[PDB]
Structures are given as structure tokens and as C-alpha cells.
Nucleic acid binder design. Structure first.
Length: 746
RNA sequence: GGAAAUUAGGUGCGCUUGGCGUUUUAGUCCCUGAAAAGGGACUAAAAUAAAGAGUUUGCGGGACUCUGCGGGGUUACAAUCCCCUAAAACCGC
DNA sequence: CTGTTTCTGCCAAGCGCACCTAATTTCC
DNA sequence: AGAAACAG
């Protein structure tokens, strides 16, 4: 009973095979198919950036209304129309900002000047390698800016309502169409608003000193990085302790001792030269004095001029060490470096440093240092290993003397636990990798439930993901005793050579079944192909209701006049959900994650209610089935009243059994989409294999070819059979028991 | 294969911002037309997922903060269930 | 009740964390 | 990737 489970873990597929006594017992393929979190992050950053601009502008509008005795409501929009302070014939802010250098402004003029500069305050050139387009433009604009008093005068005189080359068109002041030519560093716009205040002061404009200070601080405030201390990794030994910052004295001591001790021992392995703690203390004393230890010194402190494993001038290069000591308890010192590493907000860093006995000159000095990066071990481990290494002992000798062992799991389980509950979790942030590991666990645990414990697991695929899955499996899974190494990896170059040897080289390269023949290879002829023909490829139904609520292109309602039937058709489309109106903007739907299938109780005809991401957001469950329309109008949809009974809900990759009147037998297919314009289905064959197509399947998949087996535009209304099924992760097909229609809450 | 370190180049996740683009309401400048009807360039302002939540402190506020297109767990299936997934300051009494 | 085409938001600068890869050192 | 208008 040599029981083996083999897995071909792909980017979007899981092939698995089960062998026992050199006999293939079961086969299957699990198809779970740019970055996942990226669009969510971009939309998140954009929301926060604009929400903060809005509140920043509202804050200035409050200050302007309070200082100038103006109306705050006159700077907000009402009835989706222009704010009252901006109505009528309007002098541009570019002209107002030029006048401010020469004459007194009206307080209505100064109000619009402040708000115009603050809305687009320019790029904060903090850093100042290859320079991108925006960095090129701020430098090119900086050189032109030296001939002008302010940014306002520069834009007003060089571009505002000035005609381009041999044209009757105004050139652009704002940037246009993928060009960044007008980008100007934010510090210059702060200089302009400071100059405008001073010049208006000379011209007789009266305002409290607190007003200008508040306006400047509010308009140009920028938050530091949000607290990220939770994202720091943990120690290899003490998993409950955070990693130590690299720029702490202990870490400097540990790293310096690591290079020095290892170099002295390296010379023993190479030249048999035995050095002492004194020869160690000499090299360490040179590090502790300047944080530096060039190779030229070290060789002179112990021999000739030699080339041992080299690169550059410095052997030890603690760049930030000298700055740390120049800016100034051992535990408080390491705790200070941690605060400098983590608290990027200088004011919050000033407050954190203030809890320690240090003068104001030291606190301001320590607040300016930039620390980053961490070791892989904690301060707790450094407090133990470093004293022994100070005595000249290597890292491994110190760990063995202290009985320090790397943390590893001891309680192995029958089933593989959630990857989130292992100490390998913090190593993986990529949702793509987390996805593949999840589907590996689900398939493995399903096999364990079906057949029981196994002796061995073989794995093959970025090959580090295989080493990760392997270490994760042998650290946490309990295997059958093979005696009185249970997890192994198969060489990819070897498995590819077996594919050519066993004739499988080009068997089913175009369909989903070839992931299983690879797993059959990982575990180790015509009997093998017999098992492959029995596979039903498993795909999970996609029930996620979240996503973009609508397309991102805002459209005019006139775009739909021809297709929907003018204004009357647009209002009808809005009432049916064929289009949405968000913030007064017409937008198309997002994903149709669900469709609810109904059946007329007396005619037996089927009807479909499409359900979109916006509908879930509204928490309103639609109840009207699509009806086909004439060419240029929208027919009434059909209310699902007591004449229609809910059958089931379909999601992408739901398994269904369908049969048309022209089909002699029903067929299991995967539901892919419901097309609302034609009230029809798109379905696909489980394995996407064109060569095994039966006579009955050719009726349904009349347009199939060697690359895809997909049937589009299949009408649902007169289907003879339309039933929902459920696929397990191993390819088992079960009839879907009736479940009542799932509602939206609140 | 495993523990530690160094240098360099990448990937992902996260955060702080900038500039567009679009829709809307107007304006500046120019253009065809008898009028109708418009057209183009440019400028400003508002909006930029629907919509919600919350302590610090007893209550309230936004001139506060956060959630809102991701992943994991659960299982005839994977979801709207569960977890990753909050916490301060300031103003007023 | 089928068959086919159309249309979809985007880039830039910088700072953090977790990893990967390629070399190099001490070790098991 | 996937909604849905256009087309037959």
C-alpha cells in the first residue's frame, strides 16, 4: 500500500493524482482561475486623496468666511449648479494672482486666489538616477520661473489666453492629454501665497496674523506615513517578538560582530590563521568609533594587502551610525531607534522621544534621522546572542550554548490547517500565491476525507512557491508511518523529460485535462488515459457580490437616445437597472455576479432576473425578468409574481444541466454569462476538449473548435431541461437541493 | 534543504501625495448663420464609485478619523455568515 | 432563438513592510 | 474579462 498524492500546482489550476500499490486510483483537475488587490488599492488611494482635498478646501472656506465675514454657503454648490461666489462674469484667478503683486485685492478676489492655489498645490519635491516626465518638467519650469516674481505671474503671462504657434486657439495653462509639461514644485506655490499675503499687507489689506498662519498650514499640510508597525515581521526564535531595527546599537553591534567573527573564521578556513578576542576587539573598536571599517584598515590590522571575498572600499559600512551618535541607557537607546524607525510623523516622534531623559537639542536632532529596515531576529534574541559573540563566539556557537532553536510546529494534524494559522503566513502578501495555496489545501483535505491518511505527497510547479507548499505541508500534516521524508518535490526538467518519454508530450495541451496527466507524472499507459477520460473538471461558482458598482466612464444621456428610445427610454432603462445614475452621472453596469432563474408555473417557460454589483450595494433585490425588445425601444420587463416560482440562482461557473428541443439528451455545462439583450446563456464544456465531442454535444456546441468549446446565445425561455448542480473540489457532481431565493439585508 | 549576515537587482502588499480624464454649472476668447441653430479653444467651480460607521470622553460637532472593487475561514457550494478589519486629536458644554 | 461586434480610465514620485533572485561570509 | 448592443 504505497499511497501517493501528487499535485501539479499552477497559477490557475490544481492537477492531482492518487496512487496506491503502484496503481492509479483517482484523477482530477481543479480550475480556480494583473494583481487582484491593485485596482482596489488605486481606487482606495484616490478616494482618500480627494476626500482630504475636499475637507482641506472646506477648512479654508471656513477660514475665509470667518476672516472676511463672507458666506460659507456661497462657496458650496447648490442644486448641482455653480457656487454663488463664482457666478457672473468672472476674472480668472491667474489674472487675480498677477494683480495681487501690484494692487489691493477685493476680499472676494483674495478668497478665490487662496482657493485656486490650494486646490492644485503642486508636487512636493522632497527628494531632489533617471528622472521621469514629472521630474523633468518641474526642473524645466524652475528655470523659466527665475524670470518671474511668482508662479501666478508666470502662468498668467506665458500661457493664459496666449495663442500657440500660428493658431487662433488659446494655449493650455493646465496640463492636457498625458502631458505633464506644466508641473511646478509645490514649494514655489507656497512661496507665491506667502508673497501675495505680504504684498496685500503693503497695499492695506487687513487680516489677523493667525489667519495667514492658519491658511498656510491648512493648505499645505501633508500627513506622514500611516502607522505600519503591524507589518513588521517577527523573530525567528521568539515568534511573539517583533524584529529588531537595523539601526539600533544592538543591531549595529550584532551585525558588526557577525562580519568580523565570520571573517576571522574565514581566514582560518583559508589560511589557518587563528585570531583572538584582542584581534577582534581591535576591529570592533574601529567600528564603534566611526561606524566604518574599510578593507584597507582590516588587512593592515592583521597581515598583508590581500583580496578576500571583496567588493568596494568599506568592509563594514554603518552609514547612519555616525549620524546617530552625533545627534545624542542601553535599553532606551534600542527603544529610541525603534521609535525613529517606525514613527515617521516627526511631531509624534518628538512626543515619543520626550518620554526619555534627553534634552530638547537631542530630541530635535533625533527627530530628523531617517531609519528603516529590520533584522530577522528580535531584541530579546540579540540580548542573548550578542554577549557570547562579544567573547568571540560564532552565531551558531552562541545559539547552541544558549539552547536557542528556530521555532517550528510540533503538533501535526490529520487535515492541513488554514495557511493563515501557520508561521509561514506573514511571508506571503501576494493574493495570487495565497489563492493557489488555498485551493491546494481544499483539494488535499478533500482527498484526505475521501481516502484517509497517505504515506507520501509529491509536488511540482517561481519555484519558491513549491518549496513553500512543501515546507507548509511537512510542518503541519500527519502522515502514515512508512517504517517500524513524506513530502518530496519532483524536478521540473525530469517531469518534462518523462512527458516526452511516455508520449504525453502533446496529448491534451489545448484543454484542461493535461494538468492531470502531469500530476500522474509527478506521482511516478492506456490505463492512465482511461482514468483521465473519467475526470470531470471542477470549477467553483463565483459568488462574490462585491466589485466595481458601475463602469468608470461618465456618459451623457444622449448616448442612449438611439438605442433606448430617446428620453423616455433612458428613464425606463434607469428604472430597470440597465443603466445607473450616480451623482447625477449616467454609467453602465458593473459585473452581473448573479442571475435568478424563474419558471412560469403553467407554461414551464424560464425567465431570468439579472443581478449586478450595484443592486447588492443598494440592498434591493430586483424582481423583474428580462423581456426581449424591439430594435430601438425598451419593452416592459416581467414582474415575477405568484405566477412564477424561483428555481435557483446562477453565478459565474455554476454547474447546470441543460437540453434544448433539438438535443436528444441533456448535457452538463458550466454557466458563464447571461446576456440581457438576447435573454440567452453562454456555456462551456468542463474540460474544454474539442476532440471528445459527442454527437449530442455537437448539437449544443455547434461552433466549437480545437481551441475552445463554448456555446453562446442559447435561449433559456424554451429550454426543455434547465437544472442546477454542484461540483465538489474533486469533480464530484451532485444535484443542487432546492434553496430559497437569497435576499439582500437592510 | 535549514539558521544568521552583507551588497545589488526585482516582485507583491500597504501608505502619503501630485497631474490628468470625464460629467455638471457657468465664464473668457474666437467662428458660421438673417434668424433658427449652433461650433471650437480656454478658464473656474462642484462631482469623481452607491452608501455608511466610529471611539479617544458623558454628549455633540467636522474646520476629525475610518470602512466602501482584496484575501482568508466556513461547506451538497462559497457567500451577504466569521476573520484579516481601527484608533487618536481638536472644537463646544 | 442564434451570431457577431463593440467597448472597458490613466500616469507619476516617494515612503514603508513582506518576500524573491544573483553573488559573498559563518554554521547545521 | 465581461456587459450588451448590433445583427440575423
Amino acid at each position: 500500500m504505497a499511497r501517493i498524492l501528487a499535485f501539479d500546482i499552477g497559477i490557475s489550476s490544481i492537477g492531482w493524482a492518487f496512487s496506491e500499490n503502484d496503481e492509479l486510483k483517482d484523477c482530477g483537475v481543479r480550475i480556480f482561475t494583473e494583481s487582484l488587490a491593485l485596482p482596489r488599492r488605486l481606487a482606495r488611494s484616490a478616494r482618500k486623496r480627494l476626500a482630504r482635498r475636499k475637507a482641506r478646501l472646506n477648512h479654508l472656506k471656513h477660514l475665509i468666511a470667518n476672516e472676511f465675514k463672507l458666506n460659507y454657503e456661497d462657496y458650496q454648490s447648490f442644486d448641482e449648479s455653480l457656487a454663488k461666489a463664482y457666478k457672473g462674469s468672472l476674472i480668472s484667478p491667474y489674472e487675480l494672482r498677477f494683480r495681487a503683486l501690484n494692487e489691493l485685492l477685493s476680499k472676494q478676489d483674495f478668497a478665490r486666489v487662496i482657493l485656486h492655489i490650494a486646490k492644485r498645490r503642486g508636487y512636493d519635491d522632497i527628494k531632489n538616477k533617471e528622472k521621469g516626465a514629472i521630474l523633468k518638467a518641474i526642473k524645466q519650469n524652475e528655470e523659466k520661473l527665475a524670470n518671474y516674481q511668482s508662479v501666478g505671474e508666470y502662468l498668467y503671462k506665458e500661457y493664459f489666453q496666449k495663442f500657440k504657434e500660428n493658431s487662433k486657439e488659446f494655449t493650455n495653462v493646465r496640463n492636457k492629454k498625458e502631458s505633464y509639461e506644466r508641473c511646478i514644485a509645490q514649494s514655489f506655490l507656497k512661496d507665491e501665497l506667502k508673497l501675495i499675503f505680504k504684498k496685500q499687507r503693503e497695499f492695506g489689506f487687513s487680516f489677523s496674523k493667525k489667519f495667514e498662519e492658519e491658511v498656510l498650514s491648512v493648505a499645505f499640510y501633508k500627513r506622514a506615513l500611516k502607522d505600519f508597525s503591524h507589518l513588521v515581521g517577527n523573530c525567528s526564535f521568539f515568534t511573539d517578538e517583533k524584529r529588531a531595527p537595523k539601526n539600533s546599537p544592538l543591531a549595529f553591534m550584532f551585525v558588526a560582530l557577525t562580519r568580523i567573527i565570520n571573517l576571522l573564521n574565514n581566514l582560518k578556513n583559508t589560511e589557518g590563521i587563528l585570531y583572538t578576542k584582542d584581534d577582534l576587539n581591535a576591529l570592533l573598536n574601529e567600528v564603534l568609533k566611526n561606524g566604518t571599517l574599510t578593507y584597507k584598515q582590516t588587512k593592515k590590522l592583521l597581515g598583508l594587502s590581500d583580496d578576500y571575498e571583496f567588493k568596494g572600499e568599506k568592509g563594514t559600512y554603518f552609514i547612519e551610525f555616525k549620524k546617530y551618535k552625533e545627534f545624542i541607557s542601553q535599553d532606551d537607546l534600542n527603544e529610541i531607534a525603534k521609535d525613529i524607525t517606525l514613527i515617521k510623523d516627526e511631531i509624534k516622534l518628538k512626543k515619543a522621544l520626550a518620554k526619555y531623559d534627553l534634552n530638547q537639542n537631542q530630541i530635535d536632532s533625533l527627530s530628523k534621522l531617517e531609519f528603516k529596515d529590520h533584522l530577522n531576529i528580535s531584541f530579546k534574541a540579540l540580548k542573548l546572542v550578542t554577549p557570547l559573540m562579544l567573547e568571540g563566539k560564532k552565531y551558531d556557537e552562541a545559539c547552541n550554548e544558549l539552547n536557542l532553536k528556530v521555532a517550528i510546529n510540533e503538533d501535526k494534524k490529520d487535515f492541513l490547517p488554514a495557511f493563515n494559522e501557520t508561521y509561514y503566513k506573514d511571508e506571503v502578501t501576494n493574493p495570487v500565491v495565497l489563492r493557489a495555496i488555498k485551493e491546494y489545501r481544499k483539494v488535499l483535505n478533500a482527498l484526505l476525507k475521501k481516502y484517509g491518511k497517505v504515506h507520501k505527497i509529491n509536488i511540482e510547479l517561481g519555484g519558491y512557491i513549491a518549496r513553500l507548499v512543501l515546507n507548509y505541508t511537512k510542518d503541519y500534516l500527519d502522515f502514515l508511518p512508512l517504517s517500524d521524508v513524506h513530502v518530496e518535490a519532483k524536478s521540473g526538467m525530469l517531469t518534462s523529460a518523462l512527458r516526452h518519454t511516455w508520449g504525453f508530450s502533446a496529448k491534451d495541451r489545448n484543454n484542461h485535462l493535461h494538468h492531470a496527466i502531469d500530476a500522474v507524472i509527478i506521482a511516478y499507459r492506456q490505463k492512465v488515459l482511461d482514468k483521465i477520460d473519467e475526470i470531470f473538471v471542477s470549477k467553483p461558482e463565483r459568488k462574490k457580490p462585491s466589485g466595481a458598482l458601475h463602469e468608470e466612464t461618465f456618459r451623457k444621456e444622449e448616448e442612449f437616445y438611439q438605442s433606448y428610445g430617446g428620453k423616455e427610454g433612458v428613464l425606463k432603462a434607469l428604472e430597470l437597472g440597465k443603466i445607473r445614475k450616480v451623482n447625477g452621472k449616467i454609467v453602465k453596469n458593473g459585473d452581473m455576479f448573479r442571475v435568478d432563474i424563474f419558471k412560469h408555473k403553467k407554461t414551464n417557460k424560464f425567465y431570468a432576473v439579472p443581478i449586478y454589483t450595484m443592486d447588492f450595494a443598494l440592498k434591493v433585490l430586483p424582481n423583474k425578468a428580462v423581456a426581449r425588445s424591439k430594435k430601438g425601444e425598451i419593452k416592459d420587463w416581467i414582474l415575477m409574481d405568484e405566477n412564477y416560482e424561483f428555481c435557483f440562482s446562477l453565478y459565474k461557473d455554476s454547474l447546470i444541466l441543460i437540453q434544448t428541443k433539438d438535443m436528444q439528451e441533456p448535457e452538463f455545462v458550466y454557466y458563464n454569462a447571461f446576456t440581457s439583450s438576447t435573454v440567452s446563456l453562454i456555456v462551456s464544456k468542463h474540460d474544454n476538449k474539442f476532440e471528445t465531442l459527442s454527437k449530442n454535444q455537437k448539437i449544443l456546441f455547434k461552433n466549437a473548435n480545437e481551441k475552445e468549446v463554448i456555446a453562446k446565445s442559447i435561449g433559456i425561455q424554451n429550454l426543455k431541461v434547465f437544472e442546477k448542480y454542484i461540483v465538489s473540489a474533486l469533480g464530484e457532481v451532485t444535484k443542487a437541493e432546492f434553496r430559497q431565493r437569497e435576499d439582500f439585508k437592510k
